[PDB]
């Protein structure tokens, strides 16, 4: 029947006087018989330990200090319903409202918020953040959030229901670890207070890597030279591909990328994890001058995009073949010369070869001894001719010996000995 | 001394007359005397089994059919140097060159060329392709390559080592497996002849996957309701994230996200590999009405961009609290009523509550027995009043029993019995 409303701020000194219920009850129509200061008693009340009416004085006192933010959380109104009974079965419902105060500033449970975002995070990617804690009601509760001004990240606030706000992170534009790996920001939450209260958190963003870089060689093509007969495990060329990715994604492994049936496979090797290309087989300039290696560098991660380069290994000619002498008699027989052989008569023809090339293969010849014969060398063919008088007695037979010498370093020689004999007049 | 150069095509019939060595040499100055088949002899020649000069006739004839592509491979020139010696130690060097013919068409050894390219292949990255095989020399060897006209891939021709033509593949525009995984193209090799000869092979291109799709929920937020006291392991909600990637990259694993020290953690659980959110603890509407679950779906593998959604799980109120009856007398004494009690005089006040809500919390009261008393209902307080004649003798004491019943399903009752006594004059 009878209703009395009141209101008082929260967190007030315990034992506060809200109002004299006797005054406003009599004024409003109560059966307060003169009954030794005990006319009415509280039937039941929402908060036994917080508010109490005095049967003696007939006054509303706060039993303890009121913390509205615990009773009603964010509920818009905070009323303690308290019902009193009179001496003769009469009732007065009394509803006291607890006005909220901005005694709480928004709070973050974590001192810092560390996050990991892949550099491949599409712009628009959003990450829900732990909303701050402000137990005040509505207006005095958390209202907005702010992040350190930047271009890469933004904050978007949404209200699930009846405010109760939370704010998520948003990648605003493309990230890239290889440019900036870490970010450090500051988030502050703000409540709707006359002098608004704030909370703070440090926001560390570690940009997780993505295998978005492929190995790359300094050059597409290379050219190397190797002297023939280079011993096994001789350094040909050490390739250096670069991958700026992180860990496995940035680790390069070299290997050969060609068909597997060619001589190259057997001749050379590569150190896959280091990049050293060495000679393992028989390299002979005389057999082949050049070899083509197709090397691929590959990263150890997902979406492994390999990169290739071609190395032209030219073999170099060392002077490792002696000059070969070959005597040519007309009838492949013992060289006989007549005594009366006029100066300059040809005896036998000589030919020299050399499997090398250049100055290593080019030859020059000599005729040893004091013998009466000269060796005039012609283009690629040295001829022996008679020089002097031939006496059957003073010299019946000679043992001509030809030397051949190349122009390599170290130079090489060769010797060939053939016997010549002198005749009177033989018609064989 | 004397040089005679000649030329002849390959693959000619056997016993061909290249040139008349006797005539050419004699005109060129050589010991051509009329002798019994003994004017000169071939000293040595590059290929004995291929070409030979005969002193009897004096002609440069070929022994068999010559295949230049075997002798000199791609070597630019193919010369056979025959050395001839005359009667009087005179020499005529002869070099016969073998002109190449397009008797070989370029051919590929494999039927198809299998390739694997990551959909993340940046436009411009190239994959060296296996060069075709044509043993002809220079112009007549492999010259250019051609692929099926398309937009995604192109061909690039390059020259590595003094010829040795090769063509690598080049990506023209971005690939995407989630749109098209396999490609079927045709490559043809061509040689440099008037009627060019070709070879062909099928080129299968498999687009290897890249984790370039993140899990995605159907909607941004969800809302579900669950009756309180739902037993452990009850279906709350079935989340369903989608990821079109391949294998691991497309496999979603759901899990809980948010602050760790939260009530929710103990109440619910989620099936990580399936996405079923089941209840683990006891839910009580009377304690809390709503709960906020933050679920994240993330794919296994690299560059895991997770997706989040918020589930607002609202609890439902079951009628699981009985209506509490509570009678309160003036001084909490045995209820005494005066004999001369006029109809409608108040005896004792009743108050009933119910911790439930809605019709589950709404109560209605009853008075049992034939007793001379009424229970007239007020808002929140049922009053007991006198309705009959109170005779000390006919009825000295009553044992009034009040029932209370809520409007839930199944409805709940409660009973409270107090004794009333009748008296004429009270002096205390
Ligand atoms: C025709 O003449 C040559 C030249 O021999 C020499 O002529 C002079 C220039 C002096 O050097 C003399 O000492 C000698 O006769 C003969 O060639 C040489 O033949 C000798 C004997 O056969 C070879 O001796 C050998 O040498 C090797 C190492 O060089 C030793 O290991 C052997 O044990 C042995 O002593 C010699 O190598 C060879 N060449 C040279 C440059 O000395 C040739 O034999 C001769 N022919 C005839 C038919 O008389
Ligand atoms: C007072 O009465 C209580 C209820 O008894 C009930 O009486 C009728 C109306 C039915 O509801 C019947 O089912 C019950 O027996 C008793 O339980 C109680 O004992 C009585 N008081 C005393 C002091 O005995
Ligand atoms: C590759 O080159 C870079 C740049 O000069 C250098 O820092 C790095 O040490 C080189 N690595 C190898 C393996 O040569
Ligand atoms: C998710 O929903 C799709 C329909 O869009 C369905 O094909 C798929 O099977 C569902 N996922 C699971 C795990 O059942
Ligand atoms: Ca407070
Ligand atoms: Ca407050
Ligand atoms: Ca606040
Ligand atoms: Ca990058
Ligand atoms: Ca990277
Ligand atoms: Ca990489
Ligand atoms: Ca050699
Ligand atoms: Ca050599
Ligand atoms: Ca030499
Ligand atoms: Ca041929
Ligand atoms: Ca040919
Ligand atoms: Ca050809
Ligand atoms: Ca894709
Ligand atoms: Ca994909
Ligand atoms: Ca995926
Ligand atoms: Ca309950
Ligand atoms: Ca309930
Ligand atoms: Ca109930
Ligand atoms: Cl921004
Ligand atoms: Cl890593
Ligand atoms: Cl002819
Ligand atoms: Cl569990
Ligand atoms: Ni003789």
Q: Which residues of B are annotated as a binding site for Ca(2+)?
A: 10-11, 67, 69, 100, 102-104, 119, 134, 136, 178, 191, 209-213, 228, 243, 245, 249, 284, 286, 317, 319-321, 339, 354, 356, 360, 391, 393, 406, 424
Check if A413 has its Cβ closer than 6 Å to any atom of ligand 1: no
CA distance B120 to chain A (A): 7
Ligand 1 site-directed mutation target among A399, A416, A419, A421, most atoms within 8 Å of CB: A399
Q: What residues pair up with A98 in beta bridges, in sequence order?
A: A8
Return the C-alpha torsion angle B253, B257, B260, B261, nearest 10: -130
**CA nearest B146: which of B197, B190, B180, B108?**
B190
Measured between CB atoms, which of A44, A257, A302 is closest to B302?
A302
For residue B138, count other CB atoms closer than 10 A to its CB. Answer: 14
CA distances to A60, A310, B111, B167, B186 from B146, in Å = 99, 22, 16, 9, 8
| Contact status of B381 with chain A (Cβ, < 8 Å) | yes
Tokens of A235: 């350094």
Cis check for the bond before A69: say yes or no (omega within 30 of 0). no
Query: What does the alpha-carbon distance between residue B104 and residue B114 come to, in Å, rounded to a whole number?
Result: 25
Residues of chain A neighbouring B312 (CB-CB closer than 8 A): 160-161
- The answer to whether the Cα torsion of B170, B172, B175, B181 is positive or negative is negative
- Mutation choice for A interface testing from B381, B383, B385, B386 by most A CBs within 10 A: B381
Residue nearest to atom 11 of ligand 1 (CA): A369
CA distance B13 to chain A (A): 30
A245: region left, alpha or beta (phi > 0 left; psi from -120 to 50 alpha): beta
Query: What order of strands is seen across the sheet that includes strand B153-159?
Result: B126-128, B165-171, B153-159
Measured between CB atoms, which of A44, A301, A305 is closest to B121?
A305
Chain centroid to CA B90: 83
Q: What residues pair up with A159 in beta bridges, in sequence order?
A: A165
Is A305 close to B118, i.e. CB distance below 8 A?
yes
Residues of chain B neighbouring A346 (CB-CB closer than 8 A): 88-89
In the three-class reduction of DSSP (H, G, I as helix; E, B as strand; rest coil), residue A10 is classed as: coil
How far does residue B100's CA lie from ligand 6's centre (Å)? Answer: 100
Report the first-to-last Cα separation within chain A, whole angstroms.
Answer: 167
Tokens of A176: 């890239």
> Which residue stretches of B60-113 are H helix?
68-71
Chain centroid to CA B314: 34
How far does residue B195's CA lie from ligand 14's centre (Å)? Answer: 17
Q: Are B2 and B29 in contact (CB under 8 A)?
A: yes
- Domain ranges (residues) in chain B: 1-103, 104-210, 211-319, 320-428
**CA nearest B140: which of B192, B177, B183, B91?**
B192
How far does residue A206's CA lie from ligand 3's centre (Å)? Answer: 27
Residues of chain A neighbouring B160 (CB-CB closer than 8 A): 221, 292, 310, 312
A177: region left, alpha or beta (phi > 0 left; psi from -120 to 50 alpha): alpha
Q: Give the A:B interface size as CB pairs under 8 Å.
A: 117
Query: What does the alpha-carbon distance between residue B56 and residue B39 come to, in Å, rounded to a whole number?
Result: 9
Query: What does the alpha-carbon distance between residue B144 and residue B198 come to, in Å, rounded to a whole number?
Result: 10
Query: What does the alpha-carbon distance between residue B136 and residue B141 come to, in Å, rounded to a whole number?
Result: 5
Architecture per CATH, domain B320-428, reads as Sandwich (2.60)
Interface of B with A in 12-41 (CB under 8 A): none
Q: Nearest-CA residue of chain A relative to B164? A: A292
CA distances to A40, A272, A327, A367, B360 from A352, in Å = 143, 47, 9, 13, 122
Half-sphere exposure of A73 (CA within 13 A, CB side): 5
A314 sits in which H/E element: strand A307-316
* Atom of ligand 1 lying closest to residue A400 CA: 1
Domain A211-319 bears CATH identifier 3.30.1360.70: no
**CA nearest B308: which of B245, B211, B217?**
B217
**Experimental determination approach used:** X-ray
SS (H, E, C) A260-291: CCCHHHHHEEECCCCCEEEECCCCCCCCCCEE
Measured between CB atoms, which of A128, A161, A210 is closest to B294?
A128
Is B261 close to A221, i.e. CB distance below 8 A?
no
B385 sits in which H/E element: strand B382-386
How far does residue B270's CA lie from ligand 26's centre (Å)? Answer: 9
Residues of chain B neighbouring A247 (CB-CB closer than 8 A): none
Is B303 close to A91, i.e. CB distance below 8 A?
no
> Running DSSP on this structure, what letter comes out for residue A352?
E
Tokens of A292: 């083509």
Query: What CATH number belongs to A104-210?
Result: 2.60.40.60
Query: What does the alpha-carbon distance between residue A119 and residue A227 come to, in Å, rounded to a whole number?
Result: 49
Q: Nearest-CA residue of chain A relative to B328? A: A43
**CA nearest B51: which of B32, B23, B79?**
B79
Provide φ and ψ at A122, rounded to 5°.
-60, 135
Half-sphere exposure of A140 (CA within 13 A, CB side): 17
Query: What does the alpha-carbon distance between residue A310 and residue A312 come to, in Å, rounded to a whole number?
Result: 7
Is A310 close to B160, i.e. CB distance below 8 A?
yes
| Contact status of B93 with chain A (Cβ, < 8 Å) | yes
B199 sits in which H/E element: strand B198-208
Is A160 close to B221, i.e. CB distance below 8 A?
yes
How far does residue A218's CA lie from ligand 22's centre (Å)? Answer: 81
Write out residues with Cβ below 6 Å of ligand 2: B 368-369, 399, 401, 417
Residues of chain A neighbouring B108 (CB-CB closer than 8 A): none
User: Mind giving me the DSSP string for B330-367?
Assistant: SSS--EEEESS--TT-EEEEEEEE-SS-GGGT-EEEEE
Q: Are B209 and B249 in contact (CB under 8 A)?
A: yes
Q: Nearest-CA residue of chain B relative to A109? A: B259
Provide φ and ψ at B267, rounded to 5°.
-80, -50
**B347 Cβ partners below 8 Å, 6+ apart?**
A89, B335, B337, B373, B384, B385, B386, B420
Burial category of A63 from C-beta neighbours within 10 Å (exposed 0-12, middle 13-18, buried 19 and up): middle
A410 sits in which H/E element: none
Burial category of A391 from C-beta neighbours within 10 Å (exposed 0-12, middle 13-18, buried 19 and up): exposed
Reduced DSSP (H G I as helix, E B as strand, rest coil) percent helix, strand, coil of chain B, to 5: 5, 45, 50
CA distance A290 to chain B (A): 9
Query: What does the alpha-carbon distance between residue A363 and residue A352 come to, in Å, rounded to a whole number?
Result: 7
Is B122 close to A379, i.e. CB distance below 8 A?
no
How far does residue B160's CA lie from ligand 13's centre (Å)? Answer: 31
Query: What does the alpha-carbon distance between residue A312 and residue A224 come to, in Å, rounded to a whole number?
Result: 6
Query: What does the alpha-carbon distance between residue B393 and residue B401 come to, in Å, rounded to a whole number?
Result: 21
For residue B97, count other CB atoms closer than 10 A to its CB. Answer: 16
CA distance A30 to chain B (A): 16
Q: Are B206 and B237 in contact (CB under 8 A)?
A: no
Residues of chain B neighbouring A312 (CB-CB closer than 8 A): 160-161
Q: Are B409 and B378 in contact (CB under 8 A)?
A: no
Q: Are A313 and B313 in contact (CB under 8 A)?
A: no
Cis check for the bond before A410: say yes or no (omega within 30 of 0). yes
| Contact status of A377 with chain B (Cβ, < 8 Å) | no
Measured between CB atoms, which of B43, B259, B351 is closest to A130?
B259
The vertex-A115 CA angle with A111 and A121, nearest 5°, equals 155
Burial category of B74 from C-beta neighbours within 10 Å (exposed 0-12, middle 13-18, buried 19 and up): middle
Check if A104-210 and A320-428 are the same fold. yes
């Amino acid at each position: 029947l009878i209703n009395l409303k009141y209101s008082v701020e929260e967190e007030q000194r315990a034992g506060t006087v809200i109002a004299n219920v006797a005054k406003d009850a009599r004024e409003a129509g109560f059966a307060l018989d003169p009954r030794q200061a005990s006319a009415f008693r509280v039937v039941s009340n929402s908060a036994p330990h917080l508010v109490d009416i005095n049967p003696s004085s007939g006054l509303l006192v706060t039993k303890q200090k009121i913390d509205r933010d615990l009773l009603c959380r964010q509920s818009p109104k905070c009323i303690i319903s308290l019902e009193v009974m009179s001496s003769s079965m009469e009732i007065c419902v009394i509803k006291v409202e607890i006005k909220d105060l901005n005694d709480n500033a928004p709070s973050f449970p974590a001192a810092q918020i560390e996050l990991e975002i892949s550099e491949a995070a599409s712009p628009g990617t959003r990450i829900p953040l732990d909303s701050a804690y402000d137990p005040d009601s509505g207006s005095f509760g958390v209202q907005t959030y702010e992040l350190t001004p930047n271009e890469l990240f933004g904050l978007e606030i949404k209200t699930r229901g009846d405010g109760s706000r939370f704010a998520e992170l948003v990648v605003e534009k493309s990230l890239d670890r290889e440019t900036q790996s870490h970010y450090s920001f500051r988030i502050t939450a703000l409540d709707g207070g006359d002098p608004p209260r704030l909370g703070t958190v440090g926001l560390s963003i570690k940009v997780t890597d993505s295998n978005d870089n492929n190995p790359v060689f300094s050059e597409s093509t290379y050219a190397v030279s190797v002297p023939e007969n280079s011993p096994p495990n001789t350094p040909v060329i050490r390739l250096n591909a670069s991958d700026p990715d992180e860990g496995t994604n940035g680790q390069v492994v070299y290997s050969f990328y060609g068909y597997v049936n060619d001589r190259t496979r057997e001749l050379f090797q590569i150190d896959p994890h280091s990049g050293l290309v060495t000679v393992t087989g028989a390299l002979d300039y005389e057999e082949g001058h050049v070899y083509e290696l197709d090397v691929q560098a590959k990263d150890l991660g997902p979406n492994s995009i390999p990169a290739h380069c071609k190395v032209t290994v030219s073999v170099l000619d060392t002077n490792d073949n002696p000059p070969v002498i070959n005597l040519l008699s007309v009838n492949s027989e013992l060289v006989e010369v007549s005594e009366s052989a006029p100066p300059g008569y040809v005896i036998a023809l000589v030919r020299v070869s050399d499997r090398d090339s250049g100055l290593n293969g080019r030859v020059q010849c000599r005729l040893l001894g004091n013998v009466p014969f000269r060796l005039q060398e012609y283009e690629s063919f040295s001829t022996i001719l008679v020089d002097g008088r031939l006496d059957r007695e003073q010299h019946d037979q000679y043992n001509l010996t030809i030397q051949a010498r190349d122009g390599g370093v170290p130079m090489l020689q060769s010797a060939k000995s053939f016997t010549v004999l002198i005749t009177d007049h033989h018609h064989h």
